[PDB]
């Protein structure tokens, strides 16, 4: 089915405790294949997948060179946003950036994402046309003019429609065993309250419903082994829709 | 791969 290559970056300002805590995480669908913790001793783009290890030097040296560029960009962006909102220097704030590209069954470009946040609130985002910007507040209008002078959208569109798609296809081929896998959830029920357990499914996109309805369902959660799990309960038929089951499953 | 070309806020 469709695939995406998201890149999540988080920088948290530490007041008086040194440089900001930057954590860069790369995702292909719901599988994390790279990571970068600035507090780690490695100071390299640590691989988080077995298939990404098949790529040797002159790739990790390039990923590392670009992820310290994200770290340096995010560390400075923390001070830019603190001055935009006129905040104190003794507080801990966060900048979150997510960019990625979606594809389809033909693995051709489908959609592009590039969003920023400050303290959990939307700051700026790339519109679906990938030419215009949706600035949230008046502080993000200053970013909009600077990013429209630099044609950042065109460069981002070049990445999102170009490099991102070609690299996702390479990732989808390097890690076809894991990235392209699909596991049907192991649905089972427990016993009043009736609860159905969707276990060990990938990707995380699942749907659980109850029909004979004020259900009690939790978020899907990582099992830790590359899979996910979920459950829903109703006080007193559990229907599950996942890519691993072409036909609906009723419990 | 990561986005090669970045820009500050």
């Amino acid at each position: 089915g469709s695939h995406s290559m998201r890149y999540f970056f988080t920088s948290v300002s530490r007041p008086g405790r040194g440089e900001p805590r930057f954590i860069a995480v790369g995702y292909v669908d719901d599988t994390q294949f790279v990571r970068f913790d600035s507090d780690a001793a490695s100071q390299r783009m640590e691989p988080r997948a077995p298939w990404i290890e098949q790529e040797g030097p002159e790739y990790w040296d390039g990923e590392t060179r670009k992820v310290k560029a994200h770290s340096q960009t995010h560390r400075v962006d923390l001070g830019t946003l603190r001055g935009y909102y006129n905040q104190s220097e003794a507080g801990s704030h966060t900048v979150q950036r997510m960019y990625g590209c979606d594809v389809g069954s033909d693995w051709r470009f489908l959609r592009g994402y590039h969003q920023y946040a400050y303290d959990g609130k939307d700051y700026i985002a790339l519109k679906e046309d990938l030419r215009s910007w949706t600035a949230a507040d008046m502080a993000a209008q200053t970013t909009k003019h600077k990013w429209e002078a630099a044609h950042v959208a065109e460069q981002l569109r070049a990445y999102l429609e170009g490099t991102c798609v070609e690299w996702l296809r390479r990732y989808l081929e390097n890690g076809k065993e894991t990235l392209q896998r699909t596991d049907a959830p192991k649905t089972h029920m427990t016993h009043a309250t009736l609860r159905c357990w969707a276990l060990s499914f990938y990707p995380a996109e699942i749907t659980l419903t109850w029909q004979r309805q004020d259900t009690e369902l939790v978020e899907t959660r990582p099992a830790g082994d590359g899979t996910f799990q979920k459950w829903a309960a109703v006080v007193v038929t559990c229907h599950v829709q996942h890519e691993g089951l072409p036909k609906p499953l009723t419990l | 791969s990561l986005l090669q070309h970045l820009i500050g806020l």
Partner: antibody
Amino acid sequence: VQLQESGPGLVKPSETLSLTCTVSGGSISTYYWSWIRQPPGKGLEWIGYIYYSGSTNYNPSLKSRVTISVDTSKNQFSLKLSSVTAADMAVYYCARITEIHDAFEIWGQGTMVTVSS
Amino acid sequence: DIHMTQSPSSVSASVGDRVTITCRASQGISSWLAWYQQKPGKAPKLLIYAASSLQSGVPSRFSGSESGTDFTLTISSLQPEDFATYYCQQANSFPFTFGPGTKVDIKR
């Protein structure tokens, strides 16, 4: 990479200043290729950069006079100043912008353009 | 544009000296400050970007710091190849703006 300017060093006043900067050791690619002039004795001034698609960000001080072009087929981007006066006499460096759009990493050797009739 | 200032204009120093060069900005430029080294007759060489990060290949004796509305370039244990002109460049808002430049001489 290696950047080399290939423009005439003598441009008549009130005439078009054409400079070409060849890129060796690589390609134009997705980098931003800037024109920076350092007049003899003074600091550096940034003219503007060109993207491979032709989208360029000019310096507003000379936006109406500067035309910057890219010839990615020949891996060279050009600068075409117009109505050039004596104030345009400078060492024109062609540079590559740093991957976070904040500095100029790779520089050309520079070319001294003299404006005199 | 954001006019850029440097302090001092010249730094007469000797080999083994510790050299400090200061830069300022008319408006807030965040930490988007780069440091360049330029020998006469040659193109500028980038040393420090984002006011703290060292460029690859630059000797570790070059250091940068930022306290607030102020930026500092430090050369601990100055060497004979470090005598040049140094520029601070802002990149918070377009256009890119450079500093006036600070020259480091061989003191005698």
